[PDB]
Design a protein around this ligand. Structure first.
Ligand code: ASN
Ligand code: ASN
Ligand code: ASN
Ligand code: ASN
Lengths: 326, 326, 312, 312
């Protein structure tokens, strides 16, 4: 049986409710040892070691936990066969992409959460955890990047996103599809991400104790420039715009971000729109403004990459090249 | 033949490109008269009158144009059979909901855009415009609220949203589905929005020359409180949170918005997540904080409703009731 | 305070007797006074006209005795049964179908909560006059549009053309849609006195398709044949040939599509009026069968069957 | 500077001779040196084995003469043809299929830009070694997973299980996926010397389904029968009966599903090894037919056909 390390960070998967039918849930309550012990069936498919990293709702996920996770995986890569990270659902997709860029182990790293607490009727956590371990244990999962396993589906950490606020089936790779489906404890992989991940990225956070400051501003009708201005005022390294349509900006936001990019703030145009690329060669001449188009990376994903791009370079052409290959 | 009034506001539907294959487009270039004349086939199905309201990219849409549109439709409701509004795609879904709440005519009001300029190969604007008129002309379209007609589909202004950055098929009613499909210039309606719209809402903007100030803050891992703080500092009437998952907030954003709601700022929890309701009775006790859950309204839609709710009342219980019925 | 809900069990992975099933979900007791009757205990892959006729008559007979019905059922043909009941039930109280994608013994089994939410839906006053319903994965779906979209996913049931009626959260439903097509007491289909249904078969279309299935139905003197066509209800030539001649000896022929969403329309490439065919609109081939079988209890005239496929 | 692209025309709404078609989209001249050959001029609803065999042989014979192929085709069975070519083409240069949902004369017709993007895809060096492709609505889709999801929508073609390979914007493609299942020169299927294919028919399953289509194929001595099952490939009893006896006189039986997404799996409710059936995995019934017809040129053994349905 393979050696699988479970790194817990919290989430509803480690929470509870006051009855089997209540909809109000706690987060990060149950310790990794108890969490692992609640699914004895894991012992059929791996030798599990549990470690508590933090115990929080993933809505409070942050740079400190990200750095911690990457360093821990990178250090311990040698001495296990794969990793599962238990995490809240809310920002699962951000952490998975951050690890997909900073983990240098080629061994399977699989993220998993639950939409219902283990106390609820038909709770999804036990089987999710089982399937996540199945995936971490499978030789075929190596070299595919950081994965998220939810609803019997293996999803790449780049494209995966939370598409519905409550559905157990919420996690989908909405532009390029999943890698594999899980049936009877086995996976038929038919796809792997072509974008460079893990050991083929330049991003090395091993010696870093902070990341560049990158915030996100939303666009909509009559959008205030005040949020963009506050980020600039605070010397943020980067700003990601959640634009309208194909990465467009409301005039007053556009004006502030244009000014910030001429003084050296990195500006990435992403989109509030849930599928499809923010392209070049549409309404915004990115070269002219010193902006970067995010491609299929949604705003929170664009943030991840831009923060890491900023550990390498402050140059808009070099950042756009990063956004074309990772 | 029915009398149909076309109110133009701009968009790519009224723009162009330098060749049939270029991807870079102008917005709001073509005047309503020329725009109507480019589709002579409209004269088979209606007597069209065109009026230019503004000529802009809908990424620059704003409160002034909204007020203008509602007042114009309300004034002229008597003296036409229906309306089509040509508009950019980027914020089409915001304007359609704003009109869905403030138009008091029960006659069909139909919004339409194009994803490609009329100069491009297989441009979508001509047929979109034709189908929008078909819909405005159809007796069955009355009493269904403000509609958007794109890709042979009739969509309610509440649920409709732009789901893809470039696809002609981008507009979808992602929670409840469309009202009707268009084939051979005819519509089979099988659904109508149960939420109160048009003449069954209390919202009357006829004498207003501004709307309440409502901004949108995004949530993500390590989110700065600076945007929320700038809105509060500027005395915004309302703030909508584009939360993570089921409307959750990053701790520092939560802290700022909690404070703003205790001093009387209206705070609506919506979600960055593209489908499903922001519910009550999940992780956030809205009553305790004086917050309002947005239901299926996405952040930009929540903004529309909250601005209008703020013309009636500043009370969180009364605003939540509005968010339960409109 | 609690409504009386009748559970009518037909089998499925959700099930093993109806008593065992109810007694394994004791939380139903918080929302309803549950009464269980075993109608049959089969996999829905073996569902048939007799079970349909039985369900419809029982529901209509016992309508006065209860506040609502939940029908436990296999997933495989739940969308067929739901539509039949949608067209034949005259009781105006909720009738909700439910199944399970996972075995009751499996980790994270869906059945118990699915059942709970089905009873919630049948208990809700707001559920009445919306036709027959299917309740799966926290969603309430109308019996006409609802279909099984995936072979294994717990989220498989979707109303692929017109969307769901409502979502369930915390034992409460926010309904924002109701089906406009006529149902339940507004249809003319009355199966009270019927002990058989008309014979309607389904033939598939594909590259190089054989005419042998279609001829074998026609030789068997089938009252109706539904074509699962390609694209917008088109047919492979040797199949069009058989059905065109069969529509003319009097066999009703409905064109549907193997394509999983969208309408088989009139006025595309098949001149239906010329051949006496009927276009199925958004009804998939199995759903078209249900409606065609019922149409044929009222009329054999193609023009009148079309009107039926335009109203129901 | 421009690549030589061969357009092989088979008909469809996209078309009317191949010369007229090419000459109506003169913008193709900016991206390719286009050469047109009329192979056939039919609606794809009447597509067949002979056209398939013809396309495969022409592509393989003329591989050296051109840099890539675009096949203009009806939409109705484009996903069948694409998969056949996916399994039989040995040329490693791009082969891209394309159609149109709207008439060429209609407002906002899709054909011209669809054709342009198909030629862009066949011209792109990055398109090579990805198998046979379908290019529709600004998207590049692999021939195995791609299917027609809607009867009328211009956005109908989707890879419903594994997603698209790449999106087209401004005449350029960002490929992020390639099919892992073996294709093109990595399959053993060689149709160079073949002038017929094995006979494989499709039967539909539904409530109360007739065994008559299945018996009529078996009586006709069909080499294979694909079942479009319910749910996870299940069969109505009287249909399971016929196929179980037929698999035992030697007819190959593949279980697929009418359910539009997801795998017909092994190890669910049908003990395939016991009955000598083969599970289709994610291949829908029409796609399973393609693979079963080709399997049967190499072997009649059910265990070996299964291995084929596990690798291709
Ligand atoms: N279901 C969940 O895990 C949601 C929770 N707020 C979290 O992300 O930690
Ligand atoms: N296609 C379009 O209309 C997009 C444009 N930026 C607009 O919204 O005005
Ligand atoms: N999950 C299930 O219910 C499938 C089963 N074959 C049925 O329809 O009964
Ligand atoms: N739009 C089309 O191509 C449909 C036509 N029946 C075909 O497949 O040829």
């Amino acid at each position: 049986l393979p050696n699988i390390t479970i790194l817990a960070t919290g989430g509803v998967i480690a929470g509870g409710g006051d009855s089997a039918t209540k909809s109000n849930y706690t987060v990060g309550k149950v310790g990794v040892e108890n969490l692992v012990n609640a699914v004895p069936q894991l012992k059929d498919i791996a030798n599990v070691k549990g470690e508590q990293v933090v115990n929080i709702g993933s809505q409070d996920m942050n740079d400190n936990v990200w750095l911690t996770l990457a360093k821990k995986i990178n250090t311990d890569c040698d001495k296990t066969d794969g990793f599962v990270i238990t995490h809240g659902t809310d920002t699962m997709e951000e952490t998975a992409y951050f690890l997909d860029l900073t983990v240098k182990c080629d061994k399977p790293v699989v993220m998993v959460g639950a939409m219902r607490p283990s106390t609820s009727m038909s709770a999804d956590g036990p089987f999710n955890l089982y399937n996540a371990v199945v995936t971490a244990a499978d030789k075929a999962s190596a070299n595919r990047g950081v994965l998220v396993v939810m609803n019997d589906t293996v999803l790449d950490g780049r494209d995966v996103t939370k598409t519905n606020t409550t559905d157990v089936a919420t996690f989908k790779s909405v532009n390029y599809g999943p890698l594999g489906y899980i049936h009877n404890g086995k996976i038929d992989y038919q796809r792997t991400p072509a974008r460079k991940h893990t050991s083929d990225t330049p991003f090395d956070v091993s010696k870093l104790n902070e990341l560049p400051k990158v915030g996100i501003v939303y666009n909509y009708a009559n959008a205030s420039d005040l949020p963009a201005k506050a980020l600039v005022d605070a010397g943020y390294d980067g700003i990601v715009s959640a634009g309208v349509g194909n990465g467009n900006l409301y005039k007053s936001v556009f004006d502030t971000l244009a000014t910030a990019a001429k003084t050296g703030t990195a500006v990435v145009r992403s989109s509030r729109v849930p599928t499809g690329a923010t392209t070049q060669d549409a309404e915004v001449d990115d070269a002219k403004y010193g902006f970067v188009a995010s491609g299929t990376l949604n705003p929170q994903k664009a943030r991840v990459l831009l923060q890491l791009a900023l550990t390498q370079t402050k140059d808009p052409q070099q950042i756009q090249q990063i956004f074309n290959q990772y």
